[PDB]
A paper describes a structure:
IDH1 is a highly conserved, homodimeric enzyme that reversibly converts isocitrate (ICT) to α-ketoglutarate (αKG) through NADP+-dependent oxidative decarboxylation. Tumor-driving IDH1 mutants catalyze a NADPH-dependent conversion of αKG to the oncometabolite D-2-hydroxyglutarate (D2HG), while typically ablating the conventional reaction. D2HG competitively inhibits αKG-dependent enzymes like TET2 and JmjC lysine demethylases, causing DNA and histone hypermethylation and cellular de-differentiation. We identified one mutant, R132Q, that maintained weak conventional catalytic activity, drove robust D2HG production, and was resistant to mutant IDH1 inhibitors via a mechanism not yet understood.
Numbering used by the authors:
A (entry chain A): 0 to 413
B (entry chain B): 3 to 413
């Protein structure tokens, strides 16, 4: 009969597109703002405000995250040919997440939210599997081109200090054309990636695996393997052993077979491409992309960006657009806010904010575990063809049910 | 009065698989099939002795006789170079052979009703066609020791202007860099092989790439497939009510996880290498898989046992200790090659024998006679007792008796 909200501090918010934008606003309206006062720095990364500002709004939000150390980002449209038409864009703008990653740096850690009544697709997975994706280099910064006919492709290195160049033959095309590409990574980026992985394994108490293909790329993938091993021996091995965990290198194909027959419960450090791909595989194996969280941990050990690990759910948004009922899972988006607020509360020693962030995570899981859930989770239980309308809640019924349970939980603890 | 078997190129391998290989031939093959065997030793010592020329000679012999069957082989790491005092950390024979022959490697689980799958919805099989040529498996990678410029250059053979592209200006330290390529003609054969596999199985075909990122490199795989599809295969796909689609690799691994199986999955060399191990494990046992390289000439094939050489079991066999080594992938390398041998020769007896041996293998396991690894797939290893499985020679022996019965019953 006379309450006062939690003062949450400074957070950078990146508004997004299509179905995740709708969810994003329901989360703020029903779960966050009634309990938490925020110093929000909002940036509209919607497809048409980006285009409006020649994508300057993306870069500015990236700089804002550097300044305030905490960002929460909604899924955004990444333009392709179709999208330039649909929004009559000025150009095919770069992915906002590549731009944001490239400015911030670091490792992207992805993890499924587990509810005990939600069957996995992979039978053995009891505990979670946290993939740490090295968010820099390799294919994502590579230079590729078409080879139009017979000829020589070479890759050369010219030292900056003046000494003589070295020239590696890629291929003599003798029979026609094809394609070629060069790609690189940097030692300091690999070192930051190793440290974040060892640190993540130690804070979760779980073992750590790095996957490469160094049997084939002895120099390129060998560099990753060597940097991890030296940093582990010099800096982490005795800590790992003190907690009865361990670090091992694995070939990527051995690693995906090992992961598939494990029980989970390990950190999986992936090079850029493998982490991009394998984390969608892992996400689906747990049940639903809607349940996949993601946090960019920057090398300063202080800045994070939290987001859902899925897209804008265009398919559902099209149905929403023509008045048709939808059942879109908000948990990944919710945990973007709770992870961002948890981190804000850690930097600030804000006890009430940290208790709120965890209460909302608990509430989300408890609601599903009591049998109230969106359709994608119902399908995990029954199999899609066998789901009845009575087995699940639509988008708005589920937020309402969550909002109801969160008011109860928070008024209980006071 | 044996079955006429014809010419077959055999590549001998290493450690436990080398041992099982000899047992397969003496127990299951040679008692029923007379063969003109052309045998190349790809054991790690002989590759070292010949500076790996024997691997090149084997691949050439496959061009000549059209059928190869390859035993698993050691791919040396640094511990192996010490063990054998190798002249260099030789590269996998599979890479050299695939580079010489070109083609597509089709991988598919070997399914036993009593071996549980780990992925719940995979009720039908998933066939991966891995492009066998180029990309990371023919690349050149090096260490960048400090600041400097990495560039990549194309010099046309006809003497016109060369083109140079900045890969990276290293300004803050060193790192690594690599160059890699593929060929139009080899991609086309990749496409043809995939469209033909789909049509022959009556299943739909998906090609995965990452063309959102590698717009030129992966875009070429995409454009080649689409062009060949529209001009040469779309009509026949529609007549069988199947289709072809390009999918982004990320989308596709998720789609496959939640799918029911029953499709052809065309993969670039790297993805096919990685996802075929994921898929074999998902169907229940990483080792229960077929791996058959189908060459562009449409006539030549090389079946291989895809797993490792089982070093721990070999050491135990060296010390004269009981082992329980699964032979099924080596057996199916023999049956797949002989089956294709029988196809080129219109040899109905050889074709019958190859499928019999495959059938005996499945039936024997489904009846409850299996090696320790398979019993552990069923009970869980901590719960496996000695009486739940056969040792290496007992299993081979049960296979041999069941095969002898199947061939007699059939006449
Ligand atoms: N972070 C972002 O800003 C991203 C935005 N995009 C965009 O999103 C739109 C559509 O893309 P899409 O392919 O449709 O993916 P998405 O995940 O939205 O939906 C797929 C299907 O997954 C099921 N599903 C997903 N979520 C839910 C849910 N909550 N509830 C229930 N079912 C769900 C549902 O399944 P169904 O119910 O249909 O069976 C759905 O349809 C495109 O514009 C992309 O640019 C993709 C990912 C990242 C970035 C992009 C980048 O940086 O370039 C990325 O990671 C990458 O690099 O690729
Ligand atoms: N390929 C090459 O193969 C060699 C070793 O590769 P590695 O990665 O060590 O994999 P291995 O082939 O050595 O097998 C690894 C382990 O998995 C199990 N295993 C593998 N194949 C079988 C089988 N056919 N029957 C039963 N159990 C099996 C065994 O587990 P256990 O020992 O627990 O029975 C074995 O110890 C290397 O030189 C590599 O280059
Ligand atoms: O890659 C090798 O060295 C051969 C073993 C292997 O991984 C395979 O054949 O798939
Ligand atoms: Ca991805
Ligand atoms: Ca492999």
């Amino acid at each position: 009969h006379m309450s006062k909200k939690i003062s949450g501090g400074s957070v950078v918010e990146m508004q997004g597109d299509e179905m995740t934008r709708i969810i994003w606003e329901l989360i703020k309206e029903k779960l966050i703002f009634p309990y938490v006062e925020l110093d929000l720095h909002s940036y509209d990364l919607g497809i048409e405000n980006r285009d409006a500002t020649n994508d300057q709004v993306t870069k500015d939000a990236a700089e804002a995250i550097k300044k305030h150390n905490v960002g929460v980002k909604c899924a955004t449209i990444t333009p392709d040919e179709k999208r330039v038409e649909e929004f009559k864009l000025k150009q095919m703008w770069k992915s906002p997440n590549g731009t944001i990653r490239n400015i911030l740096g670091g490792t992207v850690f992805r993890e499924a939210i587990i509810c005990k009544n939600i069957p996995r697709l992979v039978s053995g997975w009891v505990k979670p599997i946290i993939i740490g994706q090295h968010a820099y280099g390799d294919q994502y910064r590579a230079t590729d081109f078409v080879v139009p006919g017979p000829g020589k492709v070479e890759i050369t290195y010219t030292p900056s200090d003046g000494t003589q160049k070295v020239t590696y033959l890629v291929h003599n095309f003798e029979e026609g054309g094809g394609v070629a590409m060069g790609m690189y990574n940097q030692d300091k980026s690999i070192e930051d990636f190793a440290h974040s992985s060892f640190q993540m394994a130690l804070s979760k108490g779980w073992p750590l695996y790095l996957s490469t293909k160094n049997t084939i790329l002895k120099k390129y993938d060998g560099r990753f393997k060597d940097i991890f091993q030296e940093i582990y021996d010099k800096q982490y091995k005795s800590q790992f052993e003190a907690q009865k965990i361990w670090y091992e290198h694995r070939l990527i194909d051995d690693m995906v077979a090992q992961a598939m027959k494990s029980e989970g419960g390990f950190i999986w450090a992936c090079k850029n491409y493998d982490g991009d791909v394998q984390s969608d595989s892992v996400a689906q194996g747990y049940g639903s992309l809607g349940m996949m969280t993601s946090v960019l941990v920057c090398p300063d050990g202080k800045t994070v960006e939290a987001e859902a690990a899925h897209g804008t759910v265009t398919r559902h948004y099209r149905m929403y657009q023509k008045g048709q009922e939808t059942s879109t899972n908000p948990i990944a988006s919710i945990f973007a806010w709770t992870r961002g607020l948890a981190h804000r509360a850690k930097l600030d020693n804000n006890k009430e904010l940290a208790f709120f962030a965890n209460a909302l995570e608990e509430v989300s899981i408890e609601t599903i575990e009591a049998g109230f859930m969106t359709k994608d989770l119902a399908a995990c239980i029954k199999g899609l063809p066998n789901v009845q309308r009575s087995d699940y809640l639509n988008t708005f019924e589920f937020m309402d049910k969550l909002g109801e349970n969160l008011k109860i939980k928070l008024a209980q603890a006071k």
